[PDB]
């Protein structure tokens, strides 16, 4: 469950980083917390 447009990709960081393709942006914190 994540903001419309954002992709969840699991990196070797043991971390899923959030990535929006329509605005070209990446986040470690869920973009719902930072809009």
């Amino acid at each position: 469950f994540l903001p419309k447009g954002w992709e969840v990709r699991h990196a070797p960081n043991g971390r899923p980083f959030f990535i929006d393709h329509n605005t070209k942006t990446t986040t470690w914190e869920d973009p719902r917390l930072k809009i």
Binding site: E7, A11, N13, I19, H21, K24, T26, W28
Partner: peptide
């Protein structure tokens, strides 16, 4: 840590 530069099309 370490943010990735974004460009995914």
């Amino acid at each position: 840590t370490a943010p990735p530069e974004y460009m995914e099309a």
